[PDB]
């Protein structure tokens, strides 16, 4: 089974002062609420991404299907800010979070995973139906369900998400109902 990326989270700093009120009014499809957040929210129809705009100029992009799409959307948002008269540069661009979702296609026993790895997986039925599994070797959190859908999130790179799923795949096959 191959994990499919759902969200690409990237932080890029414009490096110039931004006026939030001016950006919200001038930019199309821009909503800013000061009390809720200091982030001006701007979205573009072609790529489904959310942009957070701050006086520092750091911009966060979330919900991008692919890493290339996230960078392209950030470039489009930055150039729109440049059109508003605030200079925009790409500085310290990095992907903080990559989320991958895949289905094993077989039922998995949550109780068996807890018994073998109480330290690795902490699961409480009342708090949430899905088991929560954390593996030391890959830096990501794995969600295991009776359906068998697996969600991996918090990995810096796509390769880590794939590696974690492959590492736990024999364990899931062992607990297959």
């Amino acid at each position: 089974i191959v994990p499919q990326l759902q969200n690409i989270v990237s932080t890029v700093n414009l490096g110039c002062k931004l006026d939030l009120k001016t950006i919200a009014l001038r930019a199309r499809n821009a909503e800013y609420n000061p009390k809720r957040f200091a982030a001006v929210i701007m979205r573009i129809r072609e790529p489904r991404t959310t942009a957070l705009i701050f006086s520092s100029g750091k911009m966060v992009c979330t919900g991008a299907k692919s890493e290339e799409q996230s960078r392209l959307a950030a470039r489009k948002y930055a150039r729109v800010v440049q059109k508003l008269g605030f200079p925009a540069k790409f500085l310290d661009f990095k992907i903080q979070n990559m989320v991958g979702s895949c289905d094993v296609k077989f039922p998995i026993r949550l109780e068996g995973l807890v018994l073998t790895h109480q330290q690795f997986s902490s699961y409480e039925p009342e708090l949430f139906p899905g088991l929560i599994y954390r593996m030391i070797k890959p830096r990501i959190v794995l969600l295991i369900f009776v359906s068998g859908k697996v969600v991996l999130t918090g990995a810096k790179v796509r390769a880590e998400i794939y590696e974690a799923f492959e590492n736990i795949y024999p364990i899931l096959k062992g607990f297959r109902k």
């Binding site: 001038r26 199309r28 499809n29 979205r43 573009i44 129809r45 072609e46 489904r48 392209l72 470039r75 489009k76 930055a78 150039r79 729109v80 440049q82 059109k83 925009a88 540069k89 790409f90 500085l91």
Partner: protein, 122 residues
């Protein structure tokens, strides 16, 4: 009842500001002239019927386009709707609008809603 409501508003405003005109020392006849002018303009427009009328960082520009034009939004031909929003709800790209006490000018006609529900996709 939208024309009747507008005529009632005209009478209430003139009566309330009559005292202010007296305090200023402006003649009551001038206030009556203002009331006549306000009624006359509505007759000229013909919009509302009136009882009185009846009487690399550097090449950002290289990725050009991909932005909707700001000028398109304002043409002055847009239908004008004035309303009060109880709340606005957005899920994903879908938008839900809750409005109250709103008058909508559509097809050169005025429609008032006690409450309205609008579903739109962005």
């Amino acid at each position: 009842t939208v024309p009747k409501l507008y005529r009632s508003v005209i009478e209430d405003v003139i009566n309330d500001v009559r005292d202010i005109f007296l305090d200023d020392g402006v003649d009551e006849q001038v206030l009556m002239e203002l009331k006549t002018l306000w009624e006359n303009k509505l007759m000229q427009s013909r919009a509302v019927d009136g009882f009185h009328s009846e009487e690399e960082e550097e090449p950002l520009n290289s990725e050009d386009d991909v932005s909707d034009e700001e000028g398109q939004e304002l043409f002055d031909t847009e239908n004008v709707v004035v309303c009060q929003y109880d709340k606005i709800h957005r899920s994903k790209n879908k938008w839900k609008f809750h409005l109250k006490d709103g008058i909508m000018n559509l097809n050169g006609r005025d429609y008032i809603f006690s409450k309205a529900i609008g579903d739109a996709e962005w």
